[PDB]
Amino acid sequence: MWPKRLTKAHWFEIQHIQPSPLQCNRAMSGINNYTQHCKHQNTFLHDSFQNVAAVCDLLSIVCKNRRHNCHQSSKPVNMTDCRLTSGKYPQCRYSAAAQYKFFIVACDPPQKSDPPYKLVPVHLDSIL
Ligand SMILES: [Cl-]
Ligand code: NA
Ligand code: NA
Ligand code: NA
Ligand SMILES: [Zn+2]
């Protein structure tokens, strides 16, 4: 059972930091249970939390929401794009598509419950 009271960064990890190979139907089940719906799409970054969090130390750039707490990866990474293809919740089923792309994360100072880096990733802003 996932903790019931997650930080933004912890939810980012759960939703977007997962290793490959991974199967979309299985990998989405916890996320969907947590949100009580079949999420229509989700991108899994096939990199470690530590490596993704290190992107936060890179130059800050503008986000889609017009804040300036975003940061671009210095290299592309392998990622899987899970796209909902059928099922009534909780029977959610997905197609998978591999990608090899740069990403942009929004980062914030850690909350008290987060690992005590200078900044932690909280939102997958873009893939590009
Ligand atoms: Cl991972
Ligand atoms: Na509390
Ligand atoms: Na990984
Ligand atoms: Na960068
Ligand atoms: Zn949709």
Side-chain angles (χ1 to χ4, degrees), residues 17-20 45-49:
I17 293 292
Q18 301 297 156
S20 87
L45 304 175
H46 304 314
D47 203 356
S48 70
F49 176 75

Side-chain angles (χ1 to χ4, degrees), residues 105-121:
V105 283
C107 303
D108 287 349
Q111 293 175 72
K112 295 293 195 299
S113 295
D114 284 324
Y117 295 103
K118 181 186 160 182
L119 293 171
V120 288

Side-chain angles (χ1 to χ4, degrees), residues 70-89:
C70 282
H71 307 267
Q72 189 207 296
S73 65
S74 67
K75 300 173 179 78
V77 299
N78 292 109
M79 62 184 63
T80 297
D81 175 17
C82 299
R83 192 56 137 159
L84 186 65
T85 49
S86 74
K88 180 51 182 179
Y89 177 82

Side-chain angles (χ1 to χ4, degrees), residues 7-27:
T7 67
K8 294 180 63 112
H10 196 172
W11 179 245
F12 170 88
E13 180 174 356
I14 289 164
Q15 191 170 236
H16 296 298
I17 293 292
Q18 301 297 156
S20 87
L22 264 196
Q23 285 181 19
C24 287
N25 293 348
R26 180 172 303 150

Side-chain angles (χ1 to χ4, degrees), residues 28-87:
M28 291 302 293
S29 65
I31 292 163
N32 288 345
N33 170 264
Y34 205 83
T35 61
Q36 291 288 118
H37 86 316
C38 297
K39 197 176 175 188
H40 293 192
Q41 187 273 340
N42 192 56
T43 305
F44 291 106
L45 304 175
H46 304 314
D47 203 356
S48 70
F49 176 75
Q50 270 191 281
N51 261 343
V52 173
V55 175
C56 299
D57 289 324
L58 305 179
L59 288 174
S60 62
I61 63 174
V62 72
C63 305
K64 286 178 168 153
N65 66 3
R66 318 288 175 168
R67 294 197 50 194
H68 298 272
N69 67 324
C70 282
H71 307 267
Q72 189 207 296
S73 65
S74 67
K75 300 173 179 78
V77 299
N78 292 109
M79 62 184 63
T80 297
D81 175 17
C82 299
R83 192 56 137 159
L84 186 65
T85 49
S86 74

